[PDB]
């Protein structure tokens, strides 16, 4: 398919995407807290020595300023790849993201834009990260017309989705599931390649029920597909949404039209989580095919706890039990 490959874990596939970007786009710079020495998750290792201290550099410890600065770079046409050290700390930049980056092109009649901006950030739980090293903020951004939000599930998906976000002409947030940074490696092409934005991927076909998730939770619903087939002889269609907005409404409705049943799952809290947007849309377009209520299996409506994490997350057992009931509705 894509030429010579190499075993990479997710952090490695990130550095590969960033290295390929800097190599072919002379305007591109990478900046944020502690990126110069390689970053706290090693995602920028070797890149400042390779490309120069004016292209891969540390900013002061100020998130609103990191995003505002990145927008200013992108206004001149240069590629700005900003990092926010944990997705949990993206909120001081919420006004720059939502009132500024997202609206820049619209409000100017396309006289100005920040489409060459990408903000990449570690995301999702990690076993022990508690309130502020665990968050999945995607739904906060989903209500904001003008940004793209993208979340991969593996090293190969990560490099190709990050390359698309970097090259896309709209401000993008790329959320990197941090618990996968050093998990299992898979083969990833050395040279650049793209995976399309706003396109979900059906990774397993099935006929009885549709499962949708993103990031690490995709591996959760893959295991639930196995459990269900094994324990209930139920055929699950398993879908990785990938892009949160704009999202692939088409691929998800087509599937629900075939199976008649949907379970959506994410680590973020239930209330106002993105599963409600997919749920309500699917219900509107597929109403006459629904055999049972669309289920949402999500984190509880609480902050993300340290010691109680094992009981908080929407794990395979929570999902399997929800699927079971849905089958018997």
């Amino acid at each position: 398919e894509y030429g010579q490959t190499q075993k990479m874990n997710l952090f490695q596939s990130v550095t590969s995407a960033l290295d390929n970007s800097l190599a072919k786009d002379p305007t591109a710079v990478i900046f944020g807290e502690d990126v110069a020495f390689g970053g706290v998750f090693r995602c920028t290792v070797g890149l400042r020595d390779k490309y120069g201290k004016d292209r891969v550099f540390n900013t002061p410890l100020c998130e609103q300023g990191i995003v505002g600065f990145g927008i200013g770079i992108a206004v001149t046409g240069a590629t700005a790849i900003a990092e926010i050290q944990f997705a949990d700390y993206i909120f001081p930049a919420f006004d720059q993201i939502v009132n500024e980056a997202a609206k820049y092109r619209y409000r100017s009649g396309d006289l100005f834009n920040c489409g060459s901006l990408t903000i990449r950030s570690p995301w999702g739980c990690v076993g022990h990260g508690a309130l502020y090293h665990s968050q999945s903020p995607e739904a906060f951004f989903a209500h904001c017309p003008g940004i793209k939000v993208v979340i991969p599930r593996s090293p190969f998906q990560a490099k190709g989705l990050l390359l698309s976000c970097i090259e896309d002409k709209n401000p993008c947030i790329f959320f990197e599931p941090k618990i996968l940074y050093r998990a299992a490696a898979e083969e990833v092409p050395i040279e650049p390649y793209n995976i399309p934005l706003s396109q979900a991927e059906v990774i397993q076909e099935g006929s009885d029920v549709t499962l949708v998730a993103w990031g690490t939770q995709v591996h959760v619903i893959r295991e639930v597909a196995s459990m269900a087939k094994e324990k209930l002889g139920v055929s699950c269609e398993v879908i990785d949404l990938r892009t949160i907005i704009p999202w692939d409404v088409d691929t998800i409705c087509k599937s629900v039209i075939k199976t008649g049943r949907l379970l959506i799952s994410h680590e973020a809290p239930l209330t106002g989580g993105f599963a409600s947007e997919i749920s309500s849309t699917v219900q509107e377009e597929c109403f006459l095919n629904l055999e049972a209520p669309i289920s949402r299996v999500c984190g509880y409506d609480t902050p993300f706890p340290h010691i109680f994490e094992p009981f908080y997350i929407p794990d395979k057992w929570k999902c399997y039990d929800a699927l079971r009931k849905m089958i018997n509705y």
Binding site: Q64, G65, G109
Partner: protein
């Protein structure tokens, strides 16, 4: 002392460092209230034609303000922010810039556009949101932008342009084509956290940018006694390692000299400069007038003739603006993203259908196609 955070000696006596507020950073002035040059060695000796351009831009801006302000009071436009007291800061600083220097600002920077020859019809088109607005009628009045004149579209949220301006200056440094960025804001906006972000990034990343703070003693109702307790905003520059100066914003020559010199050094040295121009919420226009008179470059007759011609240029542009249609409602949906997502086209299509059936209930008469 061996501490990496600071270069300093020890002291063996406890002494708290006190702000000097009562006797602050002095105010640089070139010409007095009578238009007299106070210290000939500071005179910029701008040539007559340029100085008249300054005068005429200041006064034409004031004529347009008068008309559009009254238009707001009558409800023909929904919003207006005037430039009274700000004509000198804006025309005098713009004149010290290269034409291609990128400008960021907010509500009192129309003077910069005027000096750069932005057509009156376009200031008008934006205020009326008519078909001629390249902003497509999407933003509130006075939210001007011009890509040709290197003037970044204004947004309402205060201080957001400040760290953006620093980014554009960083990018200019890298591109190596000798350009500066200027960023205007008021003393109230300087209290937002984005000002502290911008100031700090500009110094640590070594960016060729001029921060231009206009201090008029008020942010809406809030006097400065309630906005800060240091010696204005200029006193804050040195704390970020930024070279700073304070000037008389009623003196176009003083604004010009400080801006010119800031631009020269920012560009050469890749370092930020802070100019705080003091103004009132004696007036830049009359002060320059007294200067024109003393050089023999202006007089009553010329002044009355120019007042009449500028009034008519403004009213020609005004009447034409008021009479143009607004853009096609289709344009509410474009430029959200560069491309239009299919689900957004689907909403465009739903409005089209809606107006097919219910259009008699919408003001379709005023909008194009």
């Amino acid at each position: 002392p061996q501490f990496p955070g600071a270069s300093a000696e020890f002291i063996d006596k406890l002494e708290f460092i006190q702000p000097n507020v009562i006797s602050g950073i002095p105010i640089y002035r070139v010409m007095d209230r009578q238009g007299q040059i106070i210290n000939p060695s500071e005179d910029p000796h701008l040539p007559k034609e340029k100085v008249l351009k300054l005068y005429k831009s200041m006064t034409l801006l004031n004529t347009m303000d008068r008309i559009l302000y009254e238009s707001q009071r009558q409800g023909r436009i929904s919003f207006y922010m005037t430039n009274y007291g700000e004509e000198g800061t804006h025309v005098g600083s713009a004149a010290a810039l290269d034409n291609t220097d990128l400008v960021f600002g907010q509500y009192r920077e129309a003077g910069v556009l005027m000096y750069r020859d932005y057509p009156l019809e376009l200031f008008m088109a934006q205020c009326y949101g008519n078909i001629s607005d390249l902003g497509k009628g999407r933003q509130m009045p006075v939210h001007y932008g011009c890509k040709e004149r290197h003037f970044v579209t204004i947004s309402s949220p205060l201080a957001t342009q400040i760290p953006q301006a620093v980014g554009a200056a960083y990018a200019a440094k890298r591109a190596n084509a000798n350009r500066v960025v200027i960023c205007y804001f008021g003393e109230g906006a300087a209290s937002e956290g984005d000002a502290h972000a911008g100031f700090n990034f500009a110094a640590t990343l070594e960016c060729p940018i001029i921060f231009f703070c206009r201090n008029n003693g008020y942010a809406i109702s809030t006097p400065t006694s309630e906005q800060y307790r240091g010696d204005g905003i200029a006193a804050r520059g040195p704390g970020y390692g930024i070279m700073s100066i304070r000037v008389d914003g009623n003196d176009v020559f003083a604004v010009y000299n400080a801006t010119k010199e800031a631009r020269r050094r920012a560009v050469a040295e890749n370092q930020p400069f802070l100019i705080e121009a003091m103004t009132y919420r004696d007036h830049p226009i009359s002060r320059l007038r007294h200067y024109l008179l003393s050089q023999g470059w202006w007089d009553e007759e010329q002044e009355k003739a120019w007042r009449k011609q500028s009034r008519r240029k403004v009213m020609e542009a005004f009447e034409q603006a008021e009479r143009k249609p607004k853009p096609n409602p289709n344009l509410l949906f474009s430029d959200v993203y560069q491309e239009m997502p299919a689900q957004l086209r689907k909403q465009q299509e739903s409005l089209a259908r809606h107006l097919q059936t219910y259009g008699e209930h919408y003001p379709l008469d005023h909008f194009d196609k």
